[PDB]
Amino acid sequence: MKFTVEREHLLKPLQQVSGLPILGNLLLQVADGTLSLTGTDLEMEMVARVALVQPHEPGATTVPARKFFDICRGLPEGAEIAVQLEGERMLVRSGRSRFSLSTLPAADFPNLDDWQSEVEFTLPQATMKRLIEATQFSMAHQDVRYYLNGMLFETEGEELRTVATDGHRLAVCSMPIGQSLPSHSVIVPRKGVIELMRMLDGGDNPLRVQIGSNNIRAHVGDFIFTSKLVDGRFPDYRRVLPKNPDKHLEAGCDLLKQAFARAAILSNEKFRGVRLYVSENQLKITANNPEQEEAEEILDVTYSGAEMEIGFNVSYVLDVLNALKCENVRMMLTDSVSSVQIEDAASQSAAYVVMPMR
Amino acid sequence: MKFTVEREHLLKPLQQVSLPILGNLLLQVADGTLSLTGTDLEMEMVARVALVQPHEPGATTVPARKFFDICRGLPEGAEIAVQLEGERMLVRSGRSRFSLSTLPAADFPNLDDWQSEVEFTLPQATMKRLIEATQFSMAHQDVRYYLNGMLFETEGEELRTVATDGHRLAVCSMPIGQSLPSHSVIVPRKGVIELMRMLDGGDNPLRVQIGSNNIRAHVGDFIFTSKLVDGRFPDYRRVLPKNPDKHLEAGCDLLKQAFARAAILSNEKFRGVRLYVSENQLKITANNPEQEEAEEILDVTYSGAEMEIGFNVSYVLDVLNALKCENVRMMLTDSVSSVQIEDAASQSAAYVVMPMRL
Amino acid sequence: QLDAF
Ligand SMILES: [Ca+2]
Ligand SMILES: [Ca+2]
Ligand SMILES: [Ca+2]
Ligand SMILES: [Ca+2]
Ligand SMILES: [Ca+2]
Ligand SMILES: [Ca+2]
Ligand SMILES: [Ca+2]
């Protein structure tokens, strides 16, 4: 196996794939004028393809991923990197820099089980970015209900939808993708969600998604990501959204956020409770702690419904307001013992639900 | 006690001054001035703020982090009104209100009274240079407690800093244009860091006062006082190599990048790399227990006898990163002697790294 | 803290 490639063509692929010792190695394969680089943890897999325009020789090996990446990144801009398998070592040469890396046999590198695509669609990179960033923060962390640790991806009509929840708060975002889709839902594990996000880059390359019974695959440019799915029964966001949250409050997003952030300073460090007093065109936020310290914030808002008070975990509210990258927020209320729905006043595409505190 | 002050006039002082009372700041209003003091019993920072608005004298202590967080959380340029009310301190700005717990000013601890014995003034930039040049070589939590800090030494008209962890050494000397007694003290590492952070890059001169057991630094509105480390420091003169007659000169960044790549395949624990120096050439090699190997060859300026020498590459990289210059001088003797490293353009800072037999 | 589901 031999190839000579420009540093600039290796770097991004190496970074993407680099994200039982052999799991710490990358599989390198030179075949039909292409270098393929594969990384795996048995749960998911990233494969990058790089065209070889310079003379090359076929073959495959595996090499320590972090070391190979660090060597390549460490070389100067515009470096050419010549690679050849010699004996049980992989030689890396650029300029007068030389490196000899250990290898493990390509035959030992694990594969994911073969599977069939049942559901397929294409969508803009920007749409996937939007779907993930709108909801990611609401996924559970290390919950015994394993399926909450991931993210629901649901197709319905022509929309792709993400849902994330930890039982206390929920985020949902739906985006049109302009294709007739089957009604289908799968749960992507949190590490898979992280990877799907990482592969976007923000150019114009579209994303191609294939969904099987136990796998998801995403194709973008010369990269293929495959993950196992998570089994289990994800809650139904329609049951979490308040049935008729007809008390509507509108306020400046950053004004509201900074008021909550200040009140938070004097909330209970563990329980993080704050109280909201809603009245005609006014919101009052209060907080107190076991040390008897108190915060009070008063803001002007647009509100014409009945007066009510409601308690919330301020961290959950802040998370939502930080995820809303917008000018004005709408809060949609029911009563003191029911959830609040929060949205961008200018867009219905994402919705957030926070359960109250007694 | 009452004062009203612009947010920004509080933020830098609060940043500088930051048993439960050690977690509080002492606030004092007296003779047109708000003074703020933080201490950990080892060292103390006092910041003064001119009061241009009406004020009432008195003193209290308030939680540092909470008070700082409230102030920084308020909008830019907000007016902050503060008054005592019972056992609480009231903080008000716009329609944001805060009531914080207090502890009595009477209980705020003082450092022991002491006399200044050695004094000098110098530009802040000179002190910053002296500390930055050597700080990275101080020990952390070593049983040899006198190494967990920095030597400050006066001799003739120069001030010198020395730092060592008992393995590698850094020394920096700067003339300060005042005749000084021959003297030296050890400043605790936390004290060095706090002193460094008090230097704001500006035109205020720094006044230093050294007592038998204390050091004090005065810049503009801030006064820092610390206990000294009561112990004996190693003599840097005995660590510098006697007559290093083999000078290698190379570009700092090229040398650093070569070492950084080679380090990837060095021993993770002991980090040994070998140098082979010949006429205008340097070769660096590294290998690890997996028998992986790195080699770097670069053009340098060198005309001495051919020799080989090993070093801890982490220590060398620390030096090269601290230097941040165009060209470096490596002053060599033989394979069984230390190396002295300098900015090729300046003898003001020098660094010593021990030889390794590889 | 109340639960969503
Ligand atoms: Ca092969
Ligand atoms: Ca929706
Ligand atoms: Ca509260
Ligand atoms: Ca202090
Ligand atoms: Ca302003
Ligand atoms: Ca002296
Ligand atoms: Ca000036």
Side-chain angles (χ1 to χ4, degrees), chain A residues 1 3-19 21-42 44-65 67-87 89-140 142-290 292-357, chain B residues 1-75 77-189 191-241 243-358, chain C:
Chain A
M1 182 196 79
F3 65 86
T4 304
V5 290
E6 301 186 22
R7 169 175 178 270
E8 291 56 51
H9 294 144
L10 260 192
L11 269 191
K12 176 174 159 52
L14 280 172
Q15 185 168 302
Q16 286 295 132
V17 305
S18 288
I22 206 167
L23 294 183
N25 281 19
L26 300 178
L27 169 66
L28 298 198
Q29 304 160 117
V30 176
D32 294 353
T34 298
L35 167 67
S36 296
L37 305 76
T38 305
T40 191
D41 65 7
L42 312 173
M44 66 190 173
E45 181 193 83
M46 181 71 74
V47 183
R49 294 182 57 154
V50 178
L52 302 170
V53 300
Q54 303 186 54
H56 51 275
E57 293 170 8
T61 197
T62 77
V63 279
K67 290 173 175 159
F68 187 41
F69 176 58
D70 287 344
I71 287 159
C72 289
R73 190 188 39 162
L75 286 167
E77 199 170 310
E80 282 224 318
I81 309 168
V83 175
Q84 61 177 238
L85 186 61
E86 184 160 339
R89 295 274 99 106
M90 191 176 93
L91 271 26
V92 179
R93 293 181 302 161
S94 184
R96 296 189 281 184
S97 306
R98 298 171 69 90
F99 308 87
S100 193
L101 294 170
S102 64
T103 68
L104 290 170
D108 291 349
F109 196 84
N111 283 143
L112 297 169
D113 285 0
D114 201 18
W115 57 281
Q116 313 290 150
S117 175
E118 307 289 355
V119 176
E120 305 192 348
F121 49 87
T122 297
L123 73 163
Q125 232 172 50
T127 299
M128 186 60 78
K129 173 177 151 65
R130 168 63 178 147
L131 285 167
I132 295 171
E133 73 193 9
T135 59
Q136 180 169 204
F137 77 89
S138 291
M139 298 180 304
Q142 304 278 63
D143 197 291
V144 292
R145 295 111 99 208
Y146 301 166
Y147 51 86
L148 300 184
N149 299 322
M151 180 182 285
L152 189 76
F153 282 74
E154 169 172 33
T155 56
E156 195 190 4
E158 297 199 352
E159 287 189 333
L160 180 60
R161 175 178 304 122
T162 50
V163 188
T165 185
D166 59 13
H168 309 296
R169 38 86 175 276
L170 177 142
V172 53
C173 183
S174 302
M175 296 292 283
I177 60 162
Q179 299 148 67
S180 182
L181 309 166
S183 294
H184 202 265
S185 298
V186 300
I187 307 162
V188 178
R190 75 152 314 119
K191 285 193 194 62
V193 173
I194 286 162
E195 288 310 318
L196 186 43
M197 195 58 150
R198 289 237 281 101
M199 81 191 304
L200 302 185
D201 93 22
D204 280 322
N205 284 321
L207 191 62
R208 180 65 166 183
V209 179
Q210 297 172 291
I211 297 172
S213 70
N214 280 78
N215 303 87
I216 191 167
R217 169 167 292 175
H219 311 253
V220 69
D222 302 300
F223 297 85
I224 303 179
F225 174 67
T226 308
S227 178
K228 292 174 162 182
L229 294 173
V230 184
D231 296 319
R233 275 147 32 75
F234 206 90
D236 171 11
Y237 76 94
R238 298 171 304 174
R239 295 277 129 183
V240 177
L241 297 173
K243 61 179 175 167
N244 184 192
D246 73 0
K247 297 168 182 64
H248 294 342
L249 177 154
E250 261 186 51
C253 185
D254 292 345
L255 274 180
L256 195 57
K257 182 205 297 180
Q258 290 186 183
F260 277 117
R262 286 188 304 267
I265 297 160
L266 303 179
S267 69
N268 188 284
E269 295 181 358
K270 193 168 168 284
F271 298 97
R272 308 232 76 205
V274 297
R275 303 183 81 159
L276 283 65
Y277 296 85
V278 196
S279 69
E280 198 75 7
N281 295 329
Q282 192 152 289
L283 172 65
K284 186 214 284 180
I285 300 159
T286 63
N288 55 260
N289 58 24
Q292 310 273 309
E293 302 175 315
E294 309 172 84
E296 179 184 293
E297 296 280 345
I298 298 172
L299 309 74
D300 298 334
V301 304
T302 300
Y303 185 74
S304 186
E307 293 184 2
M308 61 165 291
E309 64 180 321
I310 192 162
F312 284 117
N313 174 326
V314 68
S315 289
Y316 294 160
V317 179
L318 288 166
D319 287 349
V320 171
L321 297 174
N322 280 309
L324 293 167
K325 275 87 173 48
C326 65
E327 286 305 299
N328 300 301
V329 57
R330 182 180 294 109
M331 291 183 38
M332 305 149 79
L333 296 147
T334 299
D335 59 31
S336 69
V337 295
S338 310
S339 65
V340 61
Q341 184 166 330
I342 301 167
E343 300 171 4
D344 186 341
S347 176
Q348 288 206 23
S349 63
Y352 301 88
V353 178
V354 183
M355 222 52 41
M357 284 177 64
Chain B
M1 185 200 77
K2 184 173 295 185
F3 67 80
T4 306
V5 175
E6 285 182 26
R7 174 180 173 268
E8 285 70 39
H9 300 163
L10 282 173
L11 292 189
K12 291 178 194 287
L14 281 173
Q15 188 88 249
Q16 294 293 325
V17 299
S18 296
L19 19 150
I21 206 161
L22 299 193
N24 281 18
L25 303 172
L26 170 66
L27 308 188
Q28 299 164 116
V29 173
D31 293 356
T33 302
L34 166 67
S35 295
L36 306 91
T37 304
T39 185
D40 71 356
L41 299 175
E42 296 300 285
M43 67 202 70
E44 157 196 289
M45 182 70 75
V46 184
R48 294 170 217 288
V49 183
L51 297 175
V52 302
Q53 290 189 62
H55 50 273
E56 291 172 12
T60 190
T61 80
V62 68
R65 188 82 269 237
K66 293 173 194 177
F67 183 50
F68 193 11
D69 287 349
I70 287 162
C71 291
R72 90 147 156 286
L74 288 161
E79 295 290 1
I80 306 183
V82 172
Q83 68 180 49
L84 272 171
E85 256 219 339
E87 304 285 69
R88 304 291 157 165
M89 194 182 87
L90 264 46
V91 182
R92 301 188 310 264
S93 183
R95 290 191 292 180
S96 308
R97 271 187 70 262
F98 309 87
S99 173
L100 295 163
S101 65
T102 66
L103 294 166
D107 299 345
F108 198 81
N110 289 318
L111 300 186
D112 287 351
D113 197 43
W114 58 278
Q115 308 304 140
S116 171
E117 308 284 0
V118 174
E119 303 183 350
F120 52 87
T121 303
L122 73 166
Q124 285 178 58
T126 300
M127 187 64 83
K128 172 171 107 70
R129 166 91 169 102
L130 281 165
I131 297 171
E132 286 180 324
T134 60
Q135 189 180 353
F136 75 94
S137 298
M138 296 188 297
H140 317 251
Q141 280 112 149
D142 195 296
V143 287
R144 297 138 80 190
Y145 64 90
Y146 47 87
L147 298 182
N148 305 317
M150 181 174 293
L151 192 78
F152 286 74
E153 178 188 0
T154 50
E155 198 190 29
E157 290 175 37
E158 70 173 19
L159 177 60
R160 170 162 47 247
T161 55
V162 186
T164 185
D165 54 10
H167 304 297
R168 36 80 184 274
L169 181 140
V171 54
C172 187
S173 310
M174 295 298 281
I176 61 161
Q178 291 146 100
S179 188
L180 308 158
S182 291
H183 191 61
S184 71
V185 296
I186 308 167
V187 177
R189 55 169 297 112
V192 173
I193 294 165
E194 191 165 309
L195 171 52
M196 189 55 206
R197 182 246 256 154
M198 190 191 57
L199 307 176
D200 69 9
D203 296 345
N204 289 144
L206 168 65
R207 182 71 175 168
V208 180
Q209 292 175 113
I210 295 163
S212 58
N213 301 110
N214 301 92
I215 187 170
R216 172 168 290 173
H218 279 87
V219 193
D221 287 324
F222 306 96
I223 304 178
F224 174 69
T225 312
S226 175
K227 297 180 181 166
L228 301 167
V229 183
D230 184 21
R232 286 181 177 253
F233 204 79
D235 180 10
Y236 81 91
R237 298 155 190 89
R238 298 179 72 84
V239 182
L240 297 167
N243 269 351
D245 77 308
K246 302 172 180 67
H247 287 214
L248 176 152
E249 296 183 64
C252 186
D253 201 63
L254 282 171
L255 197 64
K256 178 199 290 188
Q257 299 319 321
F259 276 122
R261 288 187 301 267
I264 296 156
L265 299 181
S266 73
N267 185 289
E268 296 190 0
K269 197 154 149 59
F270 301 104
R271 297 282 281 180
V273 297
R274 280 200 201 91
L275 280 66
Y276 300 84
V277 66
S278 59
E279 186 179 0
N280 294 333
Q281 194 152 106
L282 175 55
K283 172 160 85 185
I284 302 152
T285 68
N287 48 69
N288 60 23
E290 303 103 286
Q291 306 305 295
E292 301 176 314
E293 293 182 301
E295 182 187 285
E296 292 284 345
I297 301 168
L298 56 159
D299 299 335
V300 302
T301 302
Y302 184 80
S303 60
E306 287 183 8
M307 59 165 283
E308 314 174 354
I309 188 162
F311 305 122
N312 181 308
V313 75
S314 291
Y315 295 163
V316 173
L317 287 164
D318 285 346
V319 174
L320 297 178
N321 284 308
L323 284 172
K324 306 176 293 291
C325 59
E326 305 167 279
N327 298 107
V328 169
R329 174 184 309 285
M330 297 189 61
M331 306 161 70
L332 299 161
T333 299
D334 55 36
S335 67
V336 298
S337 301
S338 298
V339 65
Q340 186 172 144
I341 305 170
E342 292 179 3
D343 182 333
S346 176
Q347 292 177 13
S348 67
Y351 303 90
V352 182
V353 170
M354 297 301 103
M356 291 180 68
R357 182 67 178 110
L358 290 166
Chain C
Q1 177 62 55
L2 297 178
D3 298 315
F5 51 80

